[PDB]
A paper describes a structure:
The mitochondrial calcium uniporter (MCU) is responsible for mitochondrial calcium uptake and homeostasis. MCU consists of two conserved transmembrane helices (TMs) connected by a 9‐aa linker with a four‐residue “DIME” motif flanked by an N‐terminal domain (NTD) and C‐terminal domain located within the mitochondrial matrix 11, 12, 13. MCU is associated with many regulatory proteins such as mitochondrial calcium uptake‐1 and mitochondrial calcium uptake‐2 (MICU1 and MICU2), an MCU paralog (MCUb), and essential MCU regulator (EMRE), forming the mitochondrial calcium uniporter complex (uniplex) 3, 4, 5, 6, 7. MCU NTD appears to be essential for the regulation of mitochondrial Ca2+ uptake through interaction with regulator(s) and/or modulation of post‐translational modifications.
The T4 lysozyme fusion was used to enhance solubility and to phase a new crystal structure using molecular replacement. We also determined the structure of an extended version of the MCU NTD (MCU NTD‐E), corresponding to residues 75–185, without the T4 lysozyme fusion at a 1.50 Å resolution. The structure of MCU NTD‐E was determined by molecular replacement using the MCU NTD structure as a template. Superposition of the two structures revealed a root mean square deviation (RMSD) of 0.29 Å for 90 Cα atoms. MCU NTD‐E has an additional α‐helix (α3) and a C‐terminal tail. In the structure of MCU NTD‐E, hydrophobic residues in the α2‐helix (L143, L144 and L146) together with L167 and L168 in the α3‐helix (166DLLSHENA173) form a hydrophobic surface surrounded by hydrophilic residues (namely D142, D166 and E171). This surface and C‐terminus tail (174ATLNNVKTL182) were predicted as potential protein–protein interaction (PPI) interfaces by the InterProSurf analysis 32 and the consensus Protein–Protein Interaction Site Predictor (cons‐PPISP) server 33. The C‐terminal tail in MCU NTD‐E forms an extended coil structure and contains K180, a known ubiquitination and biotinylation site 25, 26. Of interest, we observed an unidentified electron density, which is predicted as a linear lipid‐like molecule with 13–16 carbon atoms and modelled with a tetraethylene glycol molecule. The lipid‐like molecule interacts with the residues in the L1 loop, two helices (α2 and α3) and C‐terminus tail. In the crystal of MCU NTD‐E, oligomers are stabilized by additional interactions through an extended C‐terminal tail in a manner resembling domain swapping, and the interface in MCU NTD and the C‐terminal tail between subunits in the oligomer is consistent with the predicted PPI surface.
Numbering used by the authors: 74 to 182
Amino acid sequence: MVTVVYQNGLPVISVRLPSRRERCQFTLKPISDSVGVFLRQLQEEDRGIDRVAIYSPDGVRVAASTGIDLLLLDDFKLVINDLTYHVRPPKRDLLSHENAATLNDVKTL
């Protein structure tokens, strides 16, 4: 199964990759990473991947330029080679992401 879990305010997507026995996790920046960034990371991780794509639950291809914040507003399908994974991210506000991974009362100069 492909899962999405927020850790320190950022989405961590855990994926079974075809060449690998063990799961691998991908942490993404919702406000600046795109669908295409994530798909490129998958391909870089496993040379056994010949095809990767993301689709809406209704089966419509999602544009590579789409922000990860927008992707994670709802369910989606992740195709890796000949397997399609139904991904169910946890719901949170689109506004949620603007203070992600910030430590309260410590600012960097």
